[PDB]
Structures are given as C-alpha cells and as structure tokens.
Amino acid sequence: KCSLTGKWTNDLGSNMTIGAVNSRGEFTGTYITAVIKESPLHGTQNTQPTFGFTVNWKFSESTTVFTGQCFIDGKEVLKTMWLLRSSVNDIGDDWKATRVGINIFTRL
Amino acid sequence: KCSLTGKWTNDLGSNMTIGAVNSRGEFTGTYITAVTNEIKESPLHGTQNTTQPTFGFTVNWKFSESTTVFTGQCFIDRNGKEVLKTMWLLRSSVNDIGDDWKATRVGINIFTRL
Amino acid sequence: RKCSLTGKWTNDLGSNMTIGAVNSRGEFTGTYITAVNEIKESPLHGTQNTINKRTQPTFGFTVNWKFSESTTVFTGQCFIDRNGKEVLKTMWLLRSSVNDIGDDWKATRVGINIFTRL
Amino acid sequence: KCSLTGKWTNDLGSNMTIGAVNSRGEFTGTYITAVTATSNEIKESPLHGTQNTINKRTQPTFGFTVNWKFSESTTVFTGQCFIDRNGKEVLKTMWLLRSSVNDIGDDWKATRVGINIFTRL
Numbered sequence: 001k002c003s004l005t006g007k008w009t010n011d012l013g014s015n016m017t018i019g020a021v022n023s024r025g026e027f028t029g030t031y032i033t034a035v036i037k038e039s040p041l042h043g044t045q046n047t048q049p050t051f052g053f054t055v056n057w058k059f060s061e062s063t064t065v066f067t068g069q070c071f072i073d074g075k076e077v078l079k080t081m082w083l084l085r086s087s088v089n090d091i092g093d094d095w096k097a098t099r100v101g102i103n104i105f106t107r108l
Numbered sequence: 109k110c111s112l113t114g115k116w117t118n119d120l121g122s123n124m125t126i127g128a129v130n131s132r133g134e135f136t137g138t139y140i141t142a143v144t145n146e147i148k149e150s151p152l153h154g155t156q157n158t159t160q161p162t163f164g165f166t167v168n169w170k171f172s173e174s175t176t177v178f179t180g181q182c183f184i185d186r187n188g189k190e191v192l193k194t195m196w197l198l199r200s201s202v203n204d205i206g207d208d209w210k211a212t213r214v215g216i217n218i219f220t221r222l
Numbered sequence: 223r224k225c226s227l228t229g230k231w232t233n234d235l236g237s238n239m240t241i242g243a244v245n246s247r248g249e250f251t252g253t254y255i256t257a258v259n260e261i262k263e264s265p266l267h268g269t270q271n272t273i274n275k276r277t278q279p280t281f282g283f284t285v286n287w288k289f290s291e292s293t294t295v296f297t298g299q300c301f302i303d304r305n306g307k308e309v310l311k312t313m314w315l316l317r318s319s320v321n322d323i324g325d326d327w328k329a330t331r332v333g334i335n336i337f338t339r340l
Numbered sequence: 341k342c343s344l345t346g347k348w349t350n351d352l353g354s355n356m357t358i359g360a361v362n363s364r365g366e367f368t369g370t371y372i373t374a375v376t377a378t379s380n381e382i383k384e385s386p387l388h389g390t391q392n393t394i395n396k397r398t399q400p401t402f403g404f405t406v407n408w409k410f411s412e413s414t415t416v417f418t419g420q421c422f423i424d425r426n427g428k429e430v431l432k433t434m435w436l437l438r439s440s441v442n443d444i445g446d447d448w449k450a451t452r453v454g455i456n457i458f459t460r461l
C-alpha cells in the first residue's frame with residue numbers, strides 16, 4: 001500500500017496528480033511546478049516498486065525525467081531524482097544542457 | 109527532420125525501436141540492452157516536446173527490478189550524422205528507506221541510426 | 223555575514239567531517255567519517271572559490287576512502303540559511319572501481335547531502 | 341602506464357596538466373577550458389585531487405576539484421584510468437558543475453552534470 005494514484009506535494013511546493021495504474025504498470029497525470037501551467041506526465045511502474053516518468057513542459061522548451069521508489073516507515077513518501085534537459089541550438093553547447101537534482105513527495 | 113521514429117544503436121551495442129509520434133508528442137517502442145537474470149526486449153514510453161526538440165522516455169526492465177529514464181535532444185552535425193545525445197538515471201530497488209542514498213546511477217549514451 | 227567552511231559538520235545520514243583552515247588561495251584539508259568491511263576516518267582535499275566580494279562561495283572536495291577502492295567528490299555552496307544558521311548544500315558522485323573498461327557505464331552513483339554545524 | 345602525471349586533452353578541446361603524485365595519492369595541476377559559455381577572459385585554473393591507493397593490481401580511481409579563476413563556479417570530476425580497445429591511455433570521467441546562486445530558494449537549479457574523455461597530449 002504505497003500506490004502512486006492520487007495527489008502529491010513536494011519540498012519546493014510543486015504538485016502532481018497521478019491517475020490509475022493499469023495492469024502493465026502504466027500511468028498518466030498532471031504536474032504543476034511552483035518554481036506555471038499544468039503539464040501532462042507519462043510513466044511506468046515496475047511489477048515498494050520503482051518507477052519512472054517524463055514531464056513535457058507546456059510553457060518551456062525543456063523536458064524533465066524523474067525516477068524513484070515509494071516508501072513507508074506509516075507516512076508514505078516518494079524519493080526521486082530528476083534530470084532537466086534544456087534546449088540548445090548547436091551540438092557544440094550540448095555539454096551544458098543537463099541539470100540534476102532530487103525531490104521528496106508526500107500525500108496531499 | 110531529426111525525427112525519433114525508426115531504429116537506433118549506441119556506443120555500448122544496445123538497440124531500440126521507436127514507433128510513430130502522435131500529435132501530442134507521445135511515442136512507444138522497444139529497448140534491447142547489450143549489457144548487464146538474462147536480457148530481454150523491454151517496452152519504452154516517452155514524449156517529445158512540441159526542429160531539434162528535446163525528449164524523454166522511461167524503460168521498464170522486463171528482467172530486473174530496476175527502471176531507467178533517458179532524456180536528450182536530436183541533433184544534426186559535424187559529419188552530417190543524425191545523433192541523439194542522452195543522459196540517463198538508473199534506479200535500483202532497495203528494501204529500506206535508509207539505503208535510498210545508494211540506489212541511483214547516472215551516465216550517458218549516444219545513438220546513431222541503424 | 224559570511225560562511226566559513228572551517229570546523230565540524232554533520233549530515234542528514236549521520237556522517238561527520240572536520241575541515242581545517244582555508245588558506246589565501248582557497249585550499250583546504252580535512253577528515254570524513256561516514257555513518258554508512260569496517261569504516262575509518264578518511265582524509266579529504268578541496269578548494270573554495272574566491273572571486274567577487276562573495277559571502278556564500280561555492281566549493282568542492284574529494285574524499286579518498288581508506289577502507290574501499292572508491293572515491294567520492296562533493297560540490298556545493300555555503301549558505302546563510304533563512305534561520306541565521308550555516309548550511310552546506312551539496313551534490314556528490316561516488317565512483318567505484320571496475321576491472322575492465324566494458325563495465326565503466328555502471329561505475330558512478332549520484333546523490334545529495336545537507337550539512338549543518340556540530 | 342596509466343599514471344595521471346602529464347598533459348591531457350579532451351573531446352571538447354580543453355587541456356590539463358597534472359604534476360607528481362605523492363605517497364598519499366595527492367596531486368596538483370592546472371586546467372585550461374576551451375569552452376566558457378561566459379564573457380570569456382578564460383584563464384589557467386588550479387586543480388587539486390587525489391587518487392586511491394588500495395589494491396595496486398588494477399587501475400585506480402581518482403577525483404579532483406577545479407577552482408575557476410574567472411567565474412564564481414566550481415567543477416568536480418571523478419573517474420578511472422584505463423587502457424582502451426585501441427591501445428590508448430584514457431581517463432573516463434563524469435563531472436558536476438555548481439553555479440553560484442544568491443538565495444537558497446534557487447539552489448535546486450544550480451548543478452549541471454556531464455562527462456569527459458581525456459587522452460594524452
């Protein structure tokens with residue numbers, strides 16, 4: 001009972017909703033970042049379990065991917081890490097387009 | 109026309125096929141890794157933002173409790189080659205939250221067309 | 223108003239570190255005891271930036287594990303937190319040793335750490 | 341083979357020199373970057389690092405920090421020294437580049453990541 005379906009909030013104030021998880025682990029949702037337009041997300045959970053998803057920013061040329069795992073101790077918490085890819089015009093600048101960080105979500 | 113649809117290979121010998129990209133940027137595919145149970149085709153799911161647009165996708169390993177996410181951009185250069193420059197995160201499964209610090213690996217991959 | 227790295231620090235996972243004086247050129251030395259084979263004090267070596275009239279400078283250091291074939295590097299900034307406290311916000315890389323170049327792809331781990339004064 | 345001392349070049353055109361490695365694995369050096377993405381005035385910058393010295397029968401891992409002389413940033417690199425499929429000596433590294441932010445609220449966006457392959461000059 002650490003199911004991803006429902007509403008989540010993070011340490012920076014951002015929100016996300018995740019809908020039902022189908023028999024093959026897939027799910028859909030929305031993400032609202034606190035630092036802003038709803039943007040759709042798409043992902044998968046392995047069949048406690050680990051999971052990944054992609055967020056296609058509706059207001060920026062970027063993409064973010066998240067991966068993580070759901071825990072209990074219980075309070076439920078998703079521990080994630082992400083990559084944020086910026087758009088560059090030339091291949092010469094590719095070296096500077098990827099940022100990395102973390103995020104901890106708890107239920108809303 | 110640096111379009112993701114088709115077949116790709118990487119620096120480590122892995123393959124992937126990506127199907128058509130719908131009006132909302134979404135796509136589906138398969139990934140066969142040359143390196144590590146034993147290895148199997150695994151499905152992938154992702155999205156492209158909407159000439160050299162950025163993209164992301166998740167791979168759900170059919171043979172392991174892990175998950176990998178890839179993000180990148182499609183370029184043309186240097187010699188005229190189409191190339192996807194990616195970075196990925198590979199998340200392993202842990203039993204306790206105390207070991208979470210140790211569960212994420214990071215690297216890169218360059219794909220060219222097959 | 224400034225944020226000096228000299229002294230003793232603890233983190234979110236229970237680990238400790240001591241950092242000695244910072245010389246005129248930003249260099250420093252220290253020791254690292256990780257809370258997470260048997261664990262031992264390990265030396266660290268690093269630098270802090272000294273560019274503009276800057277009171278929260280960035281910095282980096284390397285830890286040479288005395289009990290493992292690995293290496294970790296940390297990089298961050300020193301803040302005066304909202305609460306008057308001093309805090310180091312860091313990210314790290316942990317590199318394992320592999321025997322062949324073919325396995326290099328799987329040798330690097332990444333995470334974070336927040337340190338506060340002891 | 342595979343001793344870090346000497347001169348190196350990378351895939352982006354940058355250079356670095358590393359001096360002698362003492363008994364405790366420490367070393368010093370210099371880094372000249374070919375790319376700034378800033379208002380240049382690019383300059384030699386000093387580096388400091390360490391190489392591991394447990395079980396000397398394969399190639400050891402190492403880390404170092406670069407203190408940019410022209411920018412408020414810092415980069416750290418970590419990696420291992422190999423002999424490659426082609427007979428070359430090669431350092432495979434990954435790095436983190438930390439930018440300076442003014443408030444703690446913007447910390448989440450201050451770290452970039454990538455890779456670099458060095459071969460001897």
Ligand SMILES: *[C@@H]1O[C@H](CO)[C@@H](O)[C@H](O)[C@H]1NC(C)=O
Pocket residue numbers: 013014015032033034035036108
């Ligand atoms: C998250 O939800 C709260 C209400 O539950 C809302 O006020 C907040 O603005 C949301 N976060 C963002 C960034 O929209």
Ligand SMILES: *[C@@H]1O[C@H](CO)[C@@H](O)[C@H](O)[C@H]1NC(C)=O
Pocket residue numbers: 117121122123140141142222
């Ligand atoms: C990928 O496809 C290429 C050519 O079609 C082949 O050489 C290679 O063996 C395939 N690799 C895997 C891991 O499926």
Ligand SMILES: *[C@@H]1O[C@H](CO)[C@@H](O)[C@H](O)[C@H]1NC(C)=O
Pocket residue numbers: 232236237238255256257340
């Ligand atoms: C770090 O210092 C603390 C002081 O709170 C002490 O309890 C502990 O012995 C030290 N940590 C480790 C892991 O040795």
Ligand SMILES: *[C@@H]1O[C@H](CO)[C@@H](O)[C@H](O)[C@H]1NC(C)=O
Pocket residue numbers: 353354355372373374461
């Ligand atoms: C690196 O060194 C070579 C010769 O030793 C020099 O020609 C080259 O310009 C250097 N790279 C940079 C970007 O300064």
